[PDB]
Design a protein around this motif. Structure first.
Motif, PDB file in Angstrom:
ATOM      1  N   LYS A 216      -3.067   4.205  -0.986  1.00  0.00           N
ATOM      2  CA  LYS A 216      -4.872   4.432   0.194  1.00  0.00           C
ATOM      3  C   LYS A 216      -3.860   4.988   0.968  1.00  0.00           C
ATOM      4  O   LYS A 216      -5.154   5.946   1.359  1.00  0.00           O
ATOM      5  CB  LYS A 216      -4.594   3.176   0.502  1.00  0.00           C
ATOM      6  N   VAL A 217      -2.618   5.733   1.644  1.00  0.00           N
ATOM      7  CA  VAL A 217      -2.491   5.766   2.500  1.00  0.00           C
ATOM      8  C   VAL A 217      -2.091   7.572   2.609  1.00  0.00           C
ATOM      9  O   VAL A 217      -2.607   8.326   2.817  1.00  0.00           O
ATOM     10  CB  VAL A 217      -0.705   5.216   3.343  1.00  0.00           C
ATOM     11  N   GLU A 218      -1.480   7.682   1.040  1.00  0.00           N
ATOM     12  CA  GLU A 218      -1.334   8.808   0.955  1.00  0.00           C
ATOM     13  C   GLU A 218      -2.965   9.841   0.386  1.00  0.00           C
ATOM     14  O   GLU A 218      -3.555  11.186   0.820  1.00  0.00           O
ATOM     15  CB  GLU A 218      -0.889   8.934  -0.407  1.00  0.00           C
ATOM     16  N   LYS A 219      -3.767   8.563   0.124  1.00  0.00           N
ATOM     17  CA  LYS A 219      -4.810   9.620  -0.491  1.00  0.00           C
ATOM     18  C   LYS A 219      -5.862   9.835   1.004  1.00  0.00           C
ATOM     19  O   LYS A 219      -7.020  10.092   1.662  1.00  0.00           O
ATOM     20  CB  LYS A 219      -6.422   8.488  -1.020  1.00  0.00           C
TER      21      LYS A 219
ATOM     22  N   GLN B 225       3.990   3.100   6.341  1.00  0.00           N
ATOM     23  CA  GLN B 225       4.434   3.424   5.014  1.00  0.00           C
ATOM     24  C   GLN B 225       5.007   3.669   4.456  1.00  0.00           C
ATOM     25  O   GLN B 225       5.624   3.061   3.349  1.00  0.00           O
ATOM     26  CB  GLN B 225       2.898   4.694   4.537  1.00  0.00           C
ATOM     27  N   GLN B 226       6.075   4.025   4.750  1.00  0.00           N
ATOM     28  CA  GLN B 226       7.755   4.676   4.977  1.00  0.00           C
ATOM     29  C   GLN B 226       8.167   3.158   5.117  1.00  0.00           C
ATOM     30  O   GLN B 226       8.973   2.853   3.609  1.00  0.00           O
ATOM     31  CB  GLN B 226       8.261   5.498   6.120  1.00  0.00           C
ATOM     32  N   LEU B 227       8.306   2.485   5.728  1.00  0.00           N
ATOM     33  CA  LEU B 227       8.995   0.846   5.785  1.00  0.00           C
ATOM     34  C   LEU B 227       7.502  -0.016   3.873  1.00  0.00           C
ATOM     35  O   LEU B 227       8.894  -0.218   3.004  1.00  0.00           O
ATOM     36  CB  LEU B 227       8.189   0.074   6.598  1.00  0.00           C
ATOM     37  N   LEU B 228       6.603   0.458   4.284  1.00  0.00           N
ATOM     38  CA  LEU B 228       6.565   0.793   2.439  1.00  0.00           C
ATOM     39  C   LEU B 228       6.860   0.704   1.685  1.00  0.00           C
ATOM     40  O   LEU B 228       7.882   0.342   0.464  1.00  0.00           O
ATOM     41  CB  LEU B 228       4.547   0.568   2.488  1.00  0.00           C
ATOM     42  N   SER B 229       7.662   2.713   1.420  1.00  0.00           N
ATOM     43  CA  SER B 229       8.625   3.018   0.596  1.00  0.00           C
ATOM     44  C   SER B 229       9.579   1.854   0.763  1.00  0.00           C
ATOM     45  O   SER B 229      10.119   2.419  -0.931  1.00  0.00           O
ATOM     46  CB  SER B 229       8.231   4.424   1.167  1.00  0.00           C
ATOM     47  N   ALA B 230      10.180   1.465   1.749  1.00  0.00           N
ATOM     48  CA  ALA B 230      11.080   0.865   1.867  1.00  0.00           C
ATOM     49  C   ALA B 230      11.486  -0.416   0.793  1.00  0.00           C
ATOM     50  O   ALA B 230      11.826  -0.705   0.092  1.00  0.00           O
ATOM     51  CB  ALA B 230      11.683   0.585   3.603  1.00  0.00           C
ATOM     52  N   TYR B 231       9.635  -1.092   1.252  1.00  0.00           N
ATOM     53  CA  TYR B 231       9.776  -1.889   0.110  1.00  0.00           C
ATOM     54  C   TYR B 231       9.285  -1.346  -1.498  1.00  0.00           C
ATOM     55  O   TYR B 231      10.050  -2.024  -2.324  1.00  0.00           O
ATOM     56  CB  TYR B 231       7.831  -2.423   0.423  1.00  0.00           C
ATOM     57  N   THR B 232       9.153   0.056  -1.167  1.00  0.00           N
ATOM     58  CA  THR B 232       9.429   0.512  -3.184  1.00  0.00           C
ATOM     59  C   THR B 232      10.579   0.457  -2.853  1.00  0.00           C
ATOM     60  O   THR B 232      10.872   0.659  -4.356  1.00  0.00           O
ATOM     61  CB  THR B 232       8.440   2.326  -2.481  1.00  0.00           C
TER      62      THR B 232
END
Lengths: 221, 50, 144, 216
Positions: free
Chosen positions: B28-31, B6-13
């Protein structure tokens, strides 16, 4: 793991208790070869000629108490022995190593074999469970014991509090007589207290099961 | 195990900051992290015998 | 016998992360090391089970409320970026990643997890037989 | 009063015995299943000889007759058997406490299925077929006595039970058998202790727990 040790008069200073039954119809009435028991509804001439009463004589009270007592969770935790004072004065000491069948035919056959024998034996041929101490129960019992009559007329209290208040070195004893018409005075002279558990009249099996349920939640037995 | 990804997804962010699937994946990961208590779970018990 | 418990807990957390990111062969090879460490170190079972978060039927409501309050503020204090095994707080952090590897497609890893979850019977796990394991070896064992 | 299966508003405790031996055969009077009177009857019809455990139902009846909860008329006894019949008895039912005298009662129950009492005022034993979910209240819970579930306290489980929530427990009176006899009918499973516990022993322990958690 392992099961708990033998809970008898030998286990005296350790954690143990006694379940005492009395005023039952347990003798040897030989039908004229072998030895039989006193049955009310089965034998009509024999029971009436013996001198007993149909409402008074009860031979299955001990069988019902054994069926409701030998399978107790405290009994599998090694905390109770069985003491039986028969109508002929016979005192019987039973360890919890085995469990008698609830079938009154088979239980009555084992009781008749004990009555003609005073001797039971194990399958492993190493532990004769049916011991007979010097009569009564309190002549060879544990050196620290608590004696009380659990009457339906005595002071009705919860079984958890009174048992939890007891020490772990004493042996709480309960006397039960399942007379269809009788009174809570069969082992009154042996009991050192008079306490109650139920607000309704119950037989020896029901009172014994209530005491076993109270002892199971007392010290987590 | 969704901590780095998800941090990689945050990297995507942090990559384009215009995609919509990465924000939904992060939500979804935060939920899932907020719903989970992340406490403990053990056993190994025993008792006596017949 | 001179190894400390903080370094052992950090090594256990590192092995749990390595098994979380590997194929099934590496997890099967590292499961016996974790079993041997759990058998040799009894404090490592504290990383496996937490008695302070347990609930009993014969308990007071105050103890259950205290346990719920302690579990509501539960966090993970382990540091993966910390290179020092003693400074890593993997002793205070539960080994949750072992539960994620329990549900696996392979049956040998599931059997190893089931054996590890139960009590330990023998100290010698015979890790030499389960040391050389790969995808081809597992396929040959399953097909034959 | 006595709580019955018709009043499905007030919570009435239902105790359902499962897999109790009640088998009848022909001699030439109809004879109930006996384990020490007939031996070749079981060994020639095609059945086994270990399926004759008929005293469990009478033992559970006598153990739940003089109970403090049955004195309050709260416990209704339902019984299901492998023959495919169900029996329902209120807590005010009176039967002879001797199995030889209860042999006549069992023959009357297996030959009439509606035993009007000796006072000729109320039929204590009522025959009902499947199912048994229509005998408890509409808001009810079903508990199965099985060792698979964790052991929980009776007072702790009864304290969380609602006042209108009826309790329908299932006791396995069979000497040998599974606990999934009414698994589709049971909702949850409960336990008494980790050590051994019988069927009528479990019923009397549940009666004691209901007395402790409900002042009975």
């Amino acid at each position: 793991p392992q099961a708990p040790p033998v809970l008898t008069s030998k286990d005296k200073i350790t954690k143990r208790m006694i379940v005492v039954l009395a005023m039952a119809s347990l003798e040897t009435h030989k039908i004229s070869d072998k030895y039989v028991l006193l049955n009310c509804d089965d034998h009509q001439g024999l029971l009436k000629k013996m001198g007993r009463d149909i409402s008074e004589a009860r031979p299955d009270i001990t069988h019902q108490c054994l069926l409701t007592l030998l399978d107790s969770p405290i009994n599998k935790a090694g905390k109770l022995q069985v003491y039986i004072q028969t109508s002929r004065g016979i005192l019987i000491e039973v360890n919890p190593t085995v469990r008698i069948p609830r079938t009154f035919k088979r239980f009555s056959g084992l009781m008749v074999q004990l009555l003609h024998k005073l001797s039971i034996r194990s399958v492993n041929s190493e532990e004769k469970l049916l011991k007979v101490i010097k009569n009564p129960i309190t002549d060879h019992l544990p050196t620290k014991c608590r004696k009380v009559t659990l009457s339906f007329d005595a002071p009705v209290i919860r079984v958890q509090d009174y048992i939890e208040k007891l020490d772990d070195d004493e042996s709480i004893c309960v006397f039960v007589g399942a007379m269809a018409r009788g009174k809570d005075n069969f082992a009154d002279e042996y009991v050192d207290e008079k306490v109650g558990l139920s607000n309704y009249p119950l037989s020896a099996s029901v009172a014994c099961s209530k005491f076993c349920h109270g002892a199971e939640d007392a010290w987590n037995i | 195990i969704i901590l780095p990804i998800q941090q990689l997804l945050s990297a995507y962010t942090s990559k384009y900051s215009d995609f919509e699937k990465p924000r939904n994946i992060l939500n979804k990961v935060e939920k899932l992290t907020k719903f989970t208590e992340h406490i403990p779970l053990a056993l190994q018990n025993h008792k006596p015998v017949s | 016998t001179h190894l400390s418990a903080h370094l052992v807990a950090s090594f256990i957390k590192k092995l749990a992360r390595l098994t979380l990111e590997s194929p099934p062969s590496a997890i099967v090879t590292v499961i016996p090391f974790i079993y041997n460490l759990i058998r040799k170190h009894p404090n490592c079972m504290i990383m496996l089970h937490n008695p302070a978060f347990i609930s009993n039927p014969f308990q007071t409501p105050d103890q259950v409320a205290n346990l719920k309050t302690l579990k509501e503020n539960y966090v993970d204090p382990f540091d993966v970026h910390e290179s020092d095994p003693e400074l890593t707080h993997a002793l205070d952090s539960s080994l949750w990643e072992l539960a994620s590897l329990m549900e696996h497609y392979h049956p040998n890893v599931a059997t190893l997890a089931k054996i590890f979850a139960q009590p330990f019977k023998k100290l010698s796990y015979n890790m030499e037989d389960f040391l050389d394991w790969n995808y081809d070896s597992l396929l040959n064992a399953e097909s034959s």
